[PDB]
Amino acid sequence: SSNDNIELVDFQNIMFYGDAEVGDNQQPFTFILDTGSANLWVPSVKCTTAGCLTKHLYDSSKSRTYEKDGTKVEMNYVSGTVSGFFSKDLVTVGNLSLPYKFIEVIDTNGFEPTYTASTFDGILGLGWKDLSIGSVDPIVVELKNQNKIENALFTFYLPVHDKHTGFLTIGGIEERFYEGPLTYEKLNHDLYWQITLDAHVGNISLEKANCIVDSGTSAITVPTDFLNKMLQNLDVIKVPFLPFYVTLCNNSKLPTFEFTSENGKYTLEPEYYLQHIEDVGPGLCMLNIIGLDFPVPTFILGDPFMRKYFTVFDYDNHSVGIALAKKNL
Numbered sequence: 001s002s003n004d005n006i007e008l009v010d011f012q013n014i015m016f017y018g019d020a021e022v023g024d025n026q027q028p029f030t031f032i033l034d035t036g037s038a039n040l041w042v043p044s045v046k047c048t049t050a051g052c053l054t055k056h057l058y059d060s061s062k063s064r065t066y067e068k069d070g071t072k073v074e075m076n077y078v079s080g081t082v083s084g085f086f087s088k089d090l091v092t093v094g095n096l097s098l099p100y101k102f103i104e105v106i107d108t109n110g111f112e113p114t115y116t117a118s119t120f121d122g123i124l125g126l127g128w129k130d131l132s133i134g135s136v137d138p139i140v141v142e143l144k145n146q147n148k149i150e151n152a153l154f155t156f157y158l159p160v161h162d163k164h165t166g167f168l169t170i171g172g173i174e175e176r177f178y179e180g181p182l183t184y185e186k187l188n189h190d191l192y193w194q195i196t197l198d199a200h201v202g203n204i205s206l207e208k209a210n211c212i213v214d215s216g217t218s219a220i221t222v223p224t225d226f227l228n229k230m231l232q233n234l235d236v237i238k239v240p241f242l243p244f245y246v247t248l249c250n251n252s253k254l255p256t257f258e259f260t261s262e263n264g265k266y267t268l269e270p271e272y273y274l275q276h277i278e279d280v281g282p283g284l285c286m287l288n289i290i291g292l293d294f295p296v297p298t299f300i301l302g303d304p305f306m307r308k309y310f311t312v313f314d315y316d317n318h319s320v321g322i323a324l325a326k327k328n329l
């Protein structure tokens with residue numbers, strides 16, 4: 001009970017959400033807790049789109065601590081786009097709270113149909129300041145600045161479907177979340193939570209690769225040439241003209257990711273990047289791996305990675321701690 005804990009609810013083993021409150025009356029909202037962006041936004045009661053009809057809305061008039069901003073802002077994600085205006089109000093996360101600058105959202109049409117199809121209301125950013133729109137100091141950083149917490153760090157312990165729940169911890173590291181050694185890796189930039197690791201998949205090896213730890217992505221992305229090289233010759237089959245590959249679950253040819261550094265070694269087994277589809281045959285599965293090319297060769301470590309590894313995000317020390325997550329409690 002020493003640190004701040006936000007319980008994470010698993011969504012069908014593919015996603016996970018975390019709740020937080022806005023306004024001095026604690027208006028509840030379901031958030032995607034995202035280490036891949038650095039902005040917080042909620043749908044407003046002034047929302048004019050159909051999606052907002054199925055979500056929890058933010059009423060500025062009901063909040064004594066609401067401060068009008070009104071600055072128009074248009075958030076562009078990879079998945080879609082939401083638009084609205086800036087507003088300042090009391091943001092409550094767990095047992096902590098602070099006056100914060102967020103985005104009241106009026107238009108969610110650019111975020112459809114993903115928005116309506118999903119159960120979350122908004123997105124909460126957990127990245128660095130330079131990643132944020134409107135130059136907003138990260139919420140944990142500001143929490144340390146206001147001496148609400150001792151250390152400006154937050155840890156992710158992801159849930160497992162029909163097993164145990166998850167936790168986002170602010171203020172410190174809890175021993176119960178991991179077993180084995182906790183190995184830190186320095187950030188190569190104060191932007192994303194990105195670290196440098198050597199990637200190894202069977203014969204394929206890409207050294208000094210840029211790895212981004214992204215909780216807002218439910219897949220592992222890899223350079224396209226890397227993926228192409230690593231898929232042959234596994235008995236995997238490509239969905240017709242869809243960018244997804246499928247195979248039998250008992251496929252022994254399936255390799256293991258090995259991200260190695262001078263500090264530590266982290267691996268990802270087939271059981272972590274395989275999703276289950278049809279129960280026909282002996283288990284049909286989909287590879288949760290996406291080919292993605294950036295100017296700098298980049299691996300994106302999404303939900304699959306973090307579901308294996310308890311992760312620590314340290315603003316003060318500018319680094320990412322990785323430990324094997326404790327199997328049960």
Ligand SMILES: CCCN(CCC)C(=O)c1cc(C(=O)N[C@@H](Cc2ccccc2)[C@@H](O)CNC(C)(C)c2ccccn2)cc(N2C=CC=CC2)c1
Binds near residue numbers: 290292
């Ligand atoms: C509708 C969500 C889809 N979904 C679940 C499917 C049911 C995902 O797992 C998912 C979420 C996102 C996403 O927008 N992530 C952003 C945050 C976010 C999350 C959900 C919805 C909307 C926004 C950002 O945090 C992305 N993070 C960065 C910027 C690092 C990024 C950039 C490019 C590609 C992947 N990730 C991106 C992806 N992609 C994966 C491979 C190639 C392109 C995009 C997948």
